[PDB]
Amino acid sequence: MNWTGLYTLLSGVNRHSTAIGRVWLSVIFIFRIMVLVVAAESVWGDEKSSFICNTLQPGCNSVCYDQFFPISHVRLWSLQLILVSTPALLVAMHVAHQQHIEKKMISGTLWWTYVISVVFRLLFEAVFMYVFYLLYPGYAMVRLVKCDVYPCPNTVDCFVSRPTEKTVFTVFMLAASGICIILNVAEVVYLIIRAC
Amino acid sequence: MNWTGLYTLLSGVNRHSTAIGRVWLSVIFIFRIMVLVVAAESVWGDEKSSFICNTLQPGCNSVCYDQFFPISHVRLWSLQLILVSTPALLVAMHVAHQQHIEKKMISGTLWWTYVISVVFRLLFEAVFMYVFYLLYPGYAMVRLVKCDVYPCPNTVDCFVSRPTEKTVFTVFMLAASGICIILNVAEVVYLIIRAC
Ligand SMILES: CC(C)CCC[C@@H](C)[C@H]1CC[C@H]2[C@@H]3CC=C4C[C@@H](O)CC[C@]4(C)[C@H]3CC[C@]12C
Ligand SMILES: CC(C)CCC[C@@H](C)[C@H]1CC[C@H]2[C@@H]3CC=C4C[C@@H](O)CC[C@]4(C)[C@H]3CC[C@]12C
C-alpha cells in the first residue's frame, strides 16, 4: 500500500494528467467511495423493510415504496461512480496496451484520448446530477409521503426511515459531485490553454 | 291456555271458516312458527359472524355475505308469516268492530271479506314462494361460494356456516308453505262450491 504505488494506481500511469486531475480528482473520488461505503448498508440498509404505510391493504407497502423510490440513492450513486470511473479505466487499459505492444516490438493520440476521457467524465457527472434532480426534486427527504397507487385505497400515509440522515448524506454526495464537475471543467480548460 | 280459548283465538271468531281453515291451516301455521322459533337464533344466529373468505382483503367478508345473502332465510320467513297473518288479523279486527258497534246499538259482507282474505293469504304465500326461488335458486345451500364483488380481488372462496342444517330447515319451511298454498286453494274452492 506504498504511497507511490497508490498514486501510480490512481493516476493511471498517464503522462498528460495535470496536478488537479492527479491529486484533487482522485481525493474527491476516494472521498465519495468512503462516504458511500459507510452509508450504503448502514443508512439505506432498511430502506424498504422499515418502510410502512398506515393501511391494511396487502401489498400497499411494496407498491408505495416502488412508487416513491424508483431507484435507491445508494444504487444511483454506485452507478454514477462506475460510469464516471469507466473512461479512466479505458485510458488506463489503453496505456497498458500501448506499453505491451511497444515492449513486443502516439503522444498526440494519448493527449486526445485523455481529453475525450475528461469530457465524457464531465458528461456522465452532469447526466447523473440531472437524473437525481429528475427523480428526487429538491435535496431533503420527508418523513411522511402520500401514496395513492393501486392497490392502495384512496390515499395512504407512508413513512420513510431516517429521512434526516439520508438528507445529510445526500448533501454530502451532491456537494462532492458538484466539486468533481468544477474540477473536470477546470481540467478541460487548463488542457486546452496549455495546448496552445 | 284453555283449548277452547286457543281455538277461539286462532279461529278469529269467524262464522264462515270451514273445518280445514279452522283446524289444518291453524296447525300448519303453528308448525311454521315453532320451526322458525327453534331455528332462528340457533341455526342462523352465526350466519354472518361465521362467514369467512380465504383472503386478506379488509371488508371482503362483509361484502361477500351481502352479495350471497341479500336477506336471510329466517327474516324472509318471518316477513312471510307476518304478511300471511295480516288478512286474518284484519278480519278478526273487523269482526270485533262489528260486535262493538252492534253492542253499541252483514253476513254477506263477512262472507265476502273472508273470501277476499283467503285469496290474499294465498297470493302472499305464492309471492314469497316465488321471491324465495328468485333469491335462492334451488333448495340446497353449498359449503363453498365464489365471490368476486369489489373490493375482493379477482374471485375468492367464501364458506357458509351449517349449509346442511339450513338446507333441512329450508325444506321443512318450503314444504309447510306448499301445504298452506294447497289448503288455501281448497278453502277457496270449497267456499265457492258451498256458495251455490
Ligand atoms: C483519477 C481517478 C478518477 C482515478 C480512478 C481510478 C479507478 C477508476 C481505478 C483505480 C484502480 C482500479 C481498480 C484496479 C483493479 C481492480 C481489480 C478488478 O478485478 C476489478 C476492478 C478493480 C477494483 C479496479 C476498479 C477501478 C479502479 C479503482
Ligand atoms: C287461521 C290462522 C291463519 C289464524 C292465525 C291467527 C293469527 C293471525 C293471530 C291469532 C292471535 C293473534 C295475536 C293476538 C294478540 C296479539 C297481541 C298484540 O299486542 C300483538 C299481536 C298479537 C300477538 C296477535 C298476532 C296475530 C295472532 C297470532
Whether the CB of A59 is below 8 Å from some CB of chain B: the reply is no
- The reply to whether omega before A151 is within 30° of 0 (cis) is yes
Protein residue closest via CA to atom 16 of ligand 2: B89
What's the CA gap between B76 and B39, in Å, rounded? 13
Residues 139..158 of A with a Cβ closer than 8 Å to B: which? Answer: 151, 153
Q: Are A171 and A139 in contact (CB under 8 A)?
A: yes
**B153 to chain A: nearest residue by CA?**
A151
C-alpha distance from residue B163 to each of A83, B41, B137 (Å)? 66, 15, 15
Among residues A24, A157, A11, the alpha carbon closest in space to that of A89 is found at A11
Residues of B in contact with A58 (CB under 8 A): 56-57
Among residues B164, B151, B12, B183, the alpha carbon closest in space to that of B85 is found at B12
Lining ligand 1 with CB less than 6 A are A 9-10, 25-26, 29, 85, 88-89
Q: Can you give the C-alpha Rg of chain A in angstroms?
A: 21
Q: How was this structure determined?
A: cryo-EM
Neighbouring-strand partners of residue B159: B52, B144
- The reply to whether omega before A70 is within 30° of 0 (cis) is no
> How many angstroms separate the alpha carbon of residue A80 from the centre of ligand 1?
14
Among residues B75, B41, B37, B77, the alpha carbon closest in space to that of B173 is found at B77
Environment class of residue A107 by beta-carbon count within 10 Å: exposed (0-12), middle (13-18) or buried (19+)?
Answer: exposed
What resolution in Å is listed for this PDB structure?
Answer: 2.9
Would you state the cell numbers that stand for residue A18, as one nine-digit string? 495535470
Ligand nearest to the CA of A14: 1
Neighbouring-strand partners of residue A159: A52, A144
What's the CA gap between B7 and B5, in Å, rounded? 5
What's the CA gap between B156 and B58, in Å, rounded? 13
Substitution site in B9, B34, B125 for ligand 2 pocket (most atoms within 8 Å of beta carbon) = B9
Q: Are B195 and B188 in contact (CB under 8 A)?
A: no
Residues of B in contact with A151 (CB under 8 A): 153
DSSP A186: H
> How many angstroms separate the alpha carbon of residue B86 from the centre of ligand 2?
9
**B60 to chain A: nearest residue by CA?**
A57
